[PDB]
Amino acid sequence: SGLRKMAQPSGLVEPCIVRVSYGNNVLNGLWLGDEVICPRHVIASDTTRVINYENEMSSVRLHNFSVSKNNVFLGVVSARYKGVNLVLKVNQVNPNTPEHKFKSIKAGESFNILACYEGCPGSVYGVNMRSQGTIKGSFIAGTCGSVGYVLENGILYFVYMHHLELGNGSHVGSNFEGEMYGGYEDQPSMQLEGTNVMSSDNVVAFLYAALINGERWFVTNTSMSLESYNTWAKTNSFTELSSTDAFSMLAAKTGQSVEKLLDSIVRLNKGFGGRTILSYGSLCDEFTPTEVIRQMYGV
Amino acid sequence: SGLRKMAQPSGLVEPCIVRVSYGNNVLNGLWLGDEVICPRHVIASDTTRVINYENEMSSVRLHNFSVSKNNVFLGVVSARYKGVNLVLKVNQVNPNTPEHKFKSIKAGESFNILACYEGCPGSVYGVNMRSQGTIKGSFIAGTCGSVGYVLENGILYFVYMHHLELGNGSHVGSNFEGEMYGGYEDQPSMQLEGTNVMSSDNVVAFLYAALINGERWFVTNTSMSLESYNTWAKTNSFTELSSTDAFSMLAAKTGQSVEKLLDSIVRLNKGFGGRTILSYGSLCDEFTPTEVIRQMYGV
Ligand SMILES: */C(=C/C(=O)OCC)[C@H](C[C@@H]1CCNC1=O)NC(=O)[C@H](CC(C)C)NC(=O)[C@@H](NC(=O)[C@H](C)NC(=O)c1cc(C)on1)C(C)C
Ligand SMILES: */C(=C\C(=O)OCC)[C@@H](C[C@@H]1CCNC1=O)NC(=O)[C@H](CC(C)C)NC(=O)[C@@H](NC(=O)[C@H](C)NC(=O)c1cc(C)on1)C(C)C
């Protein structure tokens, strides 16, 4: 076919999602146990202008909050700021809480996103952590608080919650420890992202996958050592390769070694001229060896 | 927010998915009410040689099957052909059956896929029905029985099951009417597909997306009238575009009209000349207007 960006399934998350409001602010909250996490800015009286939190947490009549799963409401007990995330102890443990574990995504790691609009999940798509800690999601008005999750061996991990969008378009969110990814703040301010660093690990996988679906026009006898490639890497914003390991697998199923790809990269780093790979016209790093292996002829 | 192929939640569908064996043959199945639906080739003795489904059904014996969710088995009390879909009556009603209707997908229409392996849901991704009634499902071995479905107004529609992959890589499945999309057959026989006919509506949606995602190079002050475009199309493997009416929303939001984008197509169809569009190296038609609107600035 191609290679296409899948998402792992979502049924385990959908019940834990709710509609948290507060004033004119309607968004989505995650509901695990008697807790309900969500972007803090829901409290803020005017999100369209620099925010003074603290101040805002000082006159927040808990009775005004408004949580609901479908048209079935919930009562609020406490609420504690935790990083950029807001916590709400509700008066009704969630019967659908999924066995899980929290973590955070390192750059170049793929993960699923479940965009929601006022408590209702609307779509499911996988994404990827850019070097600067932002994602090219596809968020818009009302998807704040959407949840991002991963599964690694029957373990459902919660890793992301959506907050805001940069001036350039990139989407910013927090991990569940209350940490906004990329250190960005929850302020309608002009904040920069800084150059994006292409994930080498992930670009190699992309090329392997290409071979796999019978695509080779971009592979020629000639090769670069991790050394060499590594240099160039440091000049054209590509992560660096530590061990040609990882790909031994693919390197076998296709006989071609990384070395032969690192060269490809460099040739390809300035357009495919008129050709394409897996339908892509430029190099892509949204996939990880895991995905190529799991997606392609494999587990 | 660039443009990503998304899927709709897998929540409702995920329970419904079961594992079916008969023989050396294992796949996936769908469990609704007291019935389980799965490809009838499950029963075919040797699935690598021409099959006679009537000789096979002739030697079928219930106790020879196997149906289960998790490791909990169900008792088959009946099995039958309805076209190419094997329907199986079992001793138990799925308590998790969701309010559902059935339906058929038309060319150019998109829908969600839950690629499953031996009973377990493993991923969700959107797809698009090609002119020839096939799709580029990223289907592998062990995915047979994978279910397709859509959600409209809040009604769940089951519309696809999987069966086989053509010699050209494309993927063929069946509607729940027991009909094989494309009129293909569950025979390991050499069946061609026939040159593909792109979706003009979907391609226009695509270009609108790009414009909304801030791309313009391919923009010129040129325009091709409707009738003019359709004559070009009918001889260029693009579908007749019978109504710019579907494009009013996007048109007003970008300032560009279908006719301007029409000419863009005739031009761009001659290869992007080296550049890319929304990262693709050539034209895409796997995005309906509906998706682009809903997905971009709009509902
Ligand atoms: C979710 C909330 C929503 O629906 O609010 C309606 C009022 C957004 C999600 C956002 C919508 C589009 N895609 C998305 O992901 N949350 C926000 O609106 C945040 C709120 C802050 C309190 C954190 N706002 C923004 O993302 C906005 N970002 C900008 O502020 C960027 C940084 N800024 C600019 O470069 C600039 C100038 C001015 C004035 O405001 N921003 C976005 C501009 C709406
Ligand atoms: C899902 C089943 C599975 O579990 O297989 C276990 C072997 C079905 C999956 C395929 C695999 C790749 N993607 C995908 O969707 N498929 C089957 O294996 C079917 C079964 C038969 C009984 C319908 N077979 C195929 O899809 C084959 N299709 C071919 O028949 C193709 C048309 N081939 C030729 O031109 C030709 C010549 C001979 C001999 O066979 N095909 C593929 C080739 C396995």
Author numbering:
A (entry chain B), B (entry chain A): 1 to 299
Publication text:
The pivotal roles played by Mpros in controlling viral replication and transcription through extensive processing of replicase polyproteins, together with the absence of closely related cellular homologues, identify the Mpro as a potentially important target for antiviral drug design. The substrate-binding pockets located in a cleft between domains I and II, and especially the S4, S2, and S1 are highly conserved among CoV Mpros suggesting the possibility for wide-spectrum inhibitor design targeting this region in the Mpros of all CoVs.
N1 binds to TGEV Mpro in a similar mode to SARS-CoV Mpro with some subtle differences. It is worth mentioning that these slight variations do not notably affect the Ki, as the binding modes of P1, P2, and P4 remain the same as in SARS-CoV Mpro.
